[PDB]
């Protein structure tokens, strides 16, 4: 193709790009969130400055993407860490694992989502909502909730989804030196919450060197939610440039 | 972690990066290459200017990576196109598909390899070297060669491996506009050829929208090679900036 | 657990009760009803005084509970018997078999549903709405309908759902003595019917000592319905105390 | 059965007809259409007079019938051909394959759909919409689309669904002589388009004597759509009698 | 396809008809017949005027079509009902279930066999000639015979095969109106019986809404035969027009 | 059923009760008990007043019911907690899981056992006694003992079997208000201990919201026993009414 | 083998007889008996003169032979018919189906048990004592009992086991002539009953030409027992010679 | 059943005899015979007086009964021994194993075949005819022949089929004393040999206490034949009474 056409391409493979252009509509995104108290100095080592930590909390998540335009039908699981930047609170995205490569690619290269390949699953096991997570062939997370035991306020749930997401864009130069090293912010604005629930909740984690979720071990379950919502993936913007 | 320690990290997840720092040492990389003639009109649409086409040729590839340091043990398959940049002959990398995420992300984010997720396999079917490629659950390529029928010159094999690799680096901004749009060269220089063969060779392609290898259909098999080698991944150089 | 807090729990295990507190919102409850003619003599034995039998009818049911708040996703199958109490027409709840233990406990202990463990399956076999029931490993009932062959009046379907349900609560004393031997009424009020259908319908039953549905043999199929509906199951009310 | 009752049955078997009376309501019918260029000569052989061809176009279809009143849950795949009848553009129904016999029977005997037995499947393979068709044990069609990559106008999708369908009704006399030989028209009137999408699209075909889709080989992909809709099966009308 | 050539085709799809032109040579057709006593009341409803019932008999059949010219290799199972038309004794064809779609189409559209899709199996289980019928996934009939226990008169077997078959052709107009409502006669003439056997025989039936063979229950087994024979199926003849 | 007969049935379904009358004779009941230390805080939350804790002890149990008259053959697993009631030491029954519904029903409704549905297995893995517990599809407990490494006194084992069991009987009214809320006592009277053993012993637990055994985590293994015995299910007696 | 030694062998093959010499010690023989009411007319045909029928009863049996000296481990199922000979009440042995060929041979050739090959299974399906019988691949009988629901009088069980068994020895001459047509009596004397139980009991039968148990249909379940016992099967005695 | 009817039944079970009356027509009986040398001492032990041995020969057989009237479809394997009776050469029937009980029963009780239960298979393994025999789950015989390598005279094959078969009929009295002890002769009279073949031939045997073919071990292979034929089961005749 001619130079003026290659410039209009979002990514490569040139004629079959890793991901298409947005917007990316997550119809019926099913969240299963668990906030838990972990080890403070293990958490401290993991959260990048200048982000601030109040309580030693982690939000484990498993998300069923039932119908995502452009990307497909996949599941995602990982840890977000409740923090604040210049007083403004939100979740720092620590690590995420999912079974859809275009979704991995679009998250890492258009935004700054800390994505790796993993095999998560969300389903109902009779009376229990079970979410699992594998890395390769090994189990790393088994989350459980009593199925829709108590109703949650759809507005507070809407506020939960809408919290700012802070992430790190780290891209090297061709020789390995830093090219982009940046703290970023994305906040969801297009949301509809169909239902929001909670109930008795546990989180079992196992050690894995490439999916090291249990580096922040669960010391106590604090809160949890099971949410059905429609969202549109938000645009990220730089809030802190480490390259002075 | 502290500000000065974050800038030292090569990628994200911050405490478990998508890939480690290299060098990435490919011990016993097994090549199965197939040079074939295709439609000129189809080829021309796919190759980006200012790269030039001589004969309408395509090099189909499948690579077994038995032992890659940093990355693991995986398989790779795709198409490279013989081209020219200011007279200098090399391969333009059109598309490639592999079953290892660290290798996908290192190639896409450290260099500019046109990589997607796919499921290739290389094996010997009694008397025939067989290379297959799947995308998802669907077969897209089946390559066959009579097993080690004719020895090839090891130095000619070395010369095939060491030619320039032309690539497009295409990264969007947060808003979807062009951030990077460059042609690069990665010439490979650190190589040991252990053995090299050829034989009767044939390539069967099938249509797939997300792995469109058959957009360059096989009209004629020109040549082929089966090469076992140790190489080191080379760094890229920018050679043409499309963003002027 | 403090004495006051013990008293506030609905059930046992104390810190993980057999079932949670309501309301239980049955979302997309799918009914497959088959009313049929049986032996009056067999019916007589089965129906307890003071409930009155008119015609010798049995309503066979298989329910798919696709999304039940607090209980989960499960299927239930059984027999209701059209009766009257003090001239008021309702269904007597004869026997029910279920897939979900919380759903059995809550039904047996918060209300008075005659529930046992069983393995029902409602599905469409291409052509046909199929409902099956197993007790243990053994098949006891196979229900068939020509898929959505004729539309039913939705208001008439609501009326069929909103009729009284007569059930026997029978709880022994620790010594085997009668302690609670009550007849109860539960009548659904909060209902939305989404669709209602008939079609050519058949019912095949098999003899089983622990799920003896065939103690009431099918002599003639009288009517049938396939209803999808949202309900909230009602508060029970004692209407006759056998022990007074 | 009384003569008068015999006469008011729609079909046979008399007491269990091959299909029930309509209307047949298609809830959430899911379309995957692929318009492509074929060889003009091959297409001419196939299209019956008086229908006229402009461009050598074929519409490959795979349709998932998630919930069809009277017929059930099934899948259909085949080819329609854009034609005109005396200046009125429509789709000629060439050949269709389904895994539901009531649907084949009603399609062939109430209307005039060119229906045979076959085994289609529509499913999301992570990032790709996949339609397949088998005849008996053999694969004949594999269709792929990048999952919902681009939004199509709902009205434009509706206009496509509502294009006249031209069908041949060909019934022999008992001696094998022509009894009925008509071109009919059916046109969808009741429609709700829920969503419509496009994206990169490929169609792979294989030769089969009894499902010879590949007699109209894929030369170029022209357009594609992925649509969910509610429709009622249209009433057919004779537009051309071959025996008058 | 030219207008004249369209008229010459027996069926549709036009270029790949549901069935080919005859004759259809049934080579090594294997019959397993069981005549039995049922309820006369049930029989009455099922048999259409002006056909006359004498004794309340049903001929259950399972046929293995080992080698049928133009149609293939397949199995069929159903019910014939011994009747008379104008004093002439024949079998009324009540319901038939088959394994082969061309065989269903040709029977329904070139003649008037009451055919639906089903899954029959005729086999010898060591001891016993076993014939089974499934509709969809569900078992509806299991037939057993002591293997070739007693030889039958071959000429008497030919006579049983060569009797008239009375069938109802019922084809609606596009609007649901009666168009063809004919009673027909087909009588086999070209027959070679290779063997004929009886033995102790039983028939087990199960209730199914879409294959309701058990609407005619087995009350007593009257006679039985196991015949291997070559036949050519006959031209049908209208004998009574309900619409005249 | 006559009113008088209704009153003499122990449970419901009326003509097929959830459980039969006793006595329930446990032939060759096989015990695997593991007493261990847990966190005192976690244990206090769990134990109801007026029961008192000395040391932070938990008895994990898995019991194979090889032959239980009235109930059948099944397995049970759970936790009992050593406590005292007004100076009388006994085991508080915390939570139990079984794969037999008659046993759950009788346990919950005749007595006051904290029974839920679960899938335990007791088996010898060559040189190790293994007890496992699953809730639904998820593993929650894995217990191991060196097979019969050391002999336990039969009388001392009998004394342990005969320790008072303290249970909560908690039944709601129809509106969900407290109806029955009692601490009861059951104490085994008929016993024959056939053999009793100990050996090295470990207990591995996993978190599950609906089977939360790991809320009482294993800090140290204190003692263990492997016992086979014959017992009769004890009659329960109220010792503390919470509503008086 | 010397002429004198030939004469000393009980059966054939000469050097490996179909069965060994007795006594045959049935250790832990487990009986599952179901006596039921059937058609007297059907019974009449089945019972041979001079044996007398009182009430129309059939004793269905399934026996598990856990440890039988000389024969092995196997299961048998069949029908006994309560009769009298010269006023002496016993069971007539109607048909028996077995899992062990030595056990069939010895029963048919050393005594006169009406034995055929069949596949019985007695097991406890959690809740329920299940006994099944297959002939070849086909299910013919499914028996169920509520597991050990009520204890029986062991002496009364011994009496039921110790009653006379009337059997027909029928051996043709080589030419098909009657050679032995004797009625025989065998009455167990050496018996130890270990346990005896009843419970709610059902029997489901299916039609099969070679195992026609359902020629005697279940009209009403009269009584039932589950007995474990040691026996030594008795010497037979001719009581009536049809040929004299 | 009337006494007179009782007397005209061939066997028992009375109303479902172990076998029907003949003649038993063996259509396409397929033979695989292997004559071999064994140890003379072992063979002498095995052969009953008055039958005489010349050379130490054994005929191993495996016979596929593709279509046997009255009995069904089954396979038989065993050993016959060339002997003479008072100067008339024939085959002594040593031991036979089959997977059809009617065939064992008729064989043992109408005639005097030394039949036990076993599992033979005759099949072509590409280039080799294979006969196997299992007793229960254990392999006892594996026979191979180069497939139809050489043509045998049809008449010579017929002469071999028609060799007298000598059999022991050994039935005990009820007390285990000799009742019948006869040497009989059966000789095939109705035969059509369709084809006969030989070729390289091997026989591998394994020791089994209940199928002890290897008590006559293979020392040398002498001859072999592969024959298909139609025969009628011969009528037997006593030639030597051991008790006269």
Short mmCIF file of C-alpha atoms in Angstrom, two decimals, chain F residues 68-199:
data_model
loop_
_atom_site.label_atom_id
_atom_site.label_comp_id
_atom_site.label_asym_id
_atom_site.label_seq_id
_atom_site.Cartn_x
_atom_site.Cartn_y
_atom_site.Cartn_z
CA UNK F 68 -26.62 -47.17 57.53
CA UNK F 69 -30.12 -48.58 57.93
CA UNK F 70 -32.76 -46.25 56.46
CA UNK F 71 -30.23 -43.83 54.97
CA UNK F 72 -27.86 -45.93 52.87
CA UNK F 73 -24.20 -45.73 51.91
CA UNK F 74 -22.55 -42.32 51.99
CA UNK F 75 -19.77 -40.12 53.31
CA UNK F 76 -19.72 -37.06 55.54
CA UNK F 77 -17.08 -34.42 56.30
CA UNK F 78 -16.88 -31.34 58.52
CA UNK F 79 -15.82 -29.64 61.73
CA UNK F 80 -16.76 -30.16 65.37
CA UNK F 81 -15.47 -27.85 68.11
CA UNK F 82 -14.49 -29.00 71.63
CA UNK F 83 -16.46 -26.84 74.04
CA UNK F 84 -18.20 -27.08 77.42
CA UNK F 85 -21.84 -26.40 78.35
CA UNK F 86 -22.16 -25.40 82.02
CA UNK F 87 -19.09 -27.46 82.96
CA UNK F 88 -19.83 -30.48 80.72
CA UNK F 89 -17.29 -30.94 77.91
CA UNK F 90 -18.65 -31.89 74.47
CA UNK F 91 -18.22 -31.22 70.73
CA UNK F 92 -20.10 -28.31 69.18
CA UNK F 93 -21.25 -29.28 65.68
CA UNK F 94 -20.08 -26.39 63.46
CA UNK F 95 -20.74 -27.59 59.87
CA UNK F 96 -21.17 -30.92 58.10
CA UNK F 97 -21.24 -31.93 54.43
CA UNK F 98 -22.69 -35.13 52.94
CA UNK F 99 -23.71 -36.68 49.62
CA UNK F 100 -27.02 -38.22 50.84
CA UNK F 101 -30.24 -36.18 51.04
CA UNK F 102 -32.29 -38.47 53.35
CA UNK F 103 -29.29 -38.19 55.73
CA UNK F 104 -29.21 -34.37 55.48
CA UNK F 105 -33.00 -34.16 55.99
CA UNK F 106 -33.19 -36.51 59.01
CA UNK F 107 -30.04 -34.85 60.43
CA UNK F 108 -31.51 -31.36 60.10
CA UNK F 109 -35.19 -32.10 60.88
CA UNK F 110 -35.30 -35.00 63.39
CA UNK F 111 -32.16 -33.87 65.22
CA UNK F 112 -30.21 -30.60 64.68
CA UNK F 113 -27.06 -31.43 62.68
CA UNK F 114 -25.58 -28.49 60.69
CA UNK F 115 -25.78 -30.37 57.40
CA UNK F 116 -25.11 -29.12 53.87
CA UNK F 117 -24.56 -30.93 50.55
CA UNK F 118 -20.95 -31.93 49.78
CA UNK F 119 -18.77 -34.67 48.28
CA UNK F 120 -16.41 -36.46 50.70
CA UNK F 121 -14.39 -39.60 49.93
CA UNK F 122 -12.49 -41.85 52.33
CA UNK F 123 -9.96 -44.22 50.74
CA UNK F 124 -6.52 -45.82 51.16
CA UNK F 125 -3.94 -44.38 48.75
CA UNK F 126 -1.55 -47.35 49.02
CA UNK F 127 0.27 -46.35 52.24
CA UNK F 128 -1.93 -43.39 53.25
CA UNK F 129 -5.49 -42.96 54.55
CA UNK F 130 -7.01 -40.08 52.52
CA UNK F 131 -10.13 -38.06 53.26
CA UNK F 132 -11.24 -35.39 50.80
CA UNK F 133 -14.13 -32.95 50.75
CA UNK F 134 -15.46 -31.02 47.77
CA UNK F 135 -18.14 -28.39 47.75
CA UNK F 136 -19.75 -28.66 44.34
CA UNK F 137 -16.83 -28.95 41.93
CA UNK F 138 -14.24 -27.44 44.28
CA UNK F 139 -11.82 -29.14 46.70
CA UNK F 140 -11.97 -27.73 50.25
CA UNK F 141 -10.24 -30.37 52.42
CA UNK F 142 -7.49 -32.97 51.96
CA UNK F 143 -6.69 -35.14 54.99
CA UNK F 144 -3.91 -37.72 55.18
CA UNK F 145 -2.74 -40.22 57.76
CA UNK F 146 0.09 -42.76 57.66
CA UNK F 147 -1.99 -45.94 57.43
CA UNK F 148 -2.69 -47.49 60.89
CA UNK F 149 0.84 -46.65 62.13
CA UNK F 150 -0.09 -46.93 65.85
CA UNK F 151 -2.80 -48.73 67.86
CA UNK F 152 -5.27 -46.73 69.94
CA UNK F 153 -7.08 -48.09 72.97
CA UNK F 154 -10.59 -49.22 71.91
CA UNK F 155 -12.15 -47.86 75.12
CA UNK F 156 -10.51 -44.45 74.74
CA UNK F 157 -11.79 -44.39 71.14
CA UNK F 158 -15.25 -45.35 72.47
CA UNK F 159 -15.08 -42.50 75.02
CA UNK F 160 -14.36 -40.07 72.19
CA UNK F 161 -17.30 -41.35 70.10
CA UNK F 162 -19.55 -40.97 73.15
CA UNK F 163 -18.67 -37.33 73.92
CA UNK F 164 -21.80 -35.18 74.03
CA UNK F 165 -22.59 -33.47 70.71
CA UNK F 166 -24.00 -29.94 71.04
CA UNK F 167 -26.20 -28.71 68.20
CA UNK F 168 -28.21 -25.61 67.27
CA UNK F 169 -31.80 -26.17 66.14
CA UNK F 170 -32.84 -23.04 64.26
CA UNK F 171 -36.14 -23.02 62.37
CA UNK F 172 -37.79 -19.81 61.15
CA UNK F 173 -41.47 -18.92 61.13
CA UNK F 174 -43.04 -18.34 57.67
CA UNK F 175 -42.25 -14.61 57.87
CA UNK F 176 -38.58 -15.33 58.67
CA UNK F 177 -38.89 -14.55 62.39
CA UNK F 178 -37.39 -16.96 64.98
CA UNK F 179 -39.70 -19.93 65.54
CA UNK F 180 -37.38 -22.47 67.15
CA UNK F 181 -33.93 -21.56 68.50
CA UNK F 182 -32.46 -24.19 70.80
CA UNK F 183 -29.20 -25.71 71.86
CA UNK F 184 -29.71 -29.47 71.99
CA UNK F 185 -27.61 -32.42 73.17
CA UNK F 186 -27.22 -35.85 71.54
CA UNK F 187 -24.96 -38.51 73.08
CA UNK F 188 -24.11 -41.92 71.60
CA UNK F 189 -25.21 -44.80 73.86
CA UNK F 190 -25.03 -47.97 71.71
CA UNK F 191 -21.47 -48.52 70.50
CA UNK F 192 -19.11 -51.29 69.49
CA UNK F 193 -15.60 -50.07 68.60
CA UNK F 194 -14.04 -52.65 66.23
CA UNK F 195 -10.63 -50.99 65.94
CA UNK F 196 -8.88 -47.68 66.51
CA UNK F 197 -5.58 -46.31 65.14
CA UNK F 198 -3.41 -43.21 64.91
CA UNK F 199 -0.34 -42.09 62.94
#
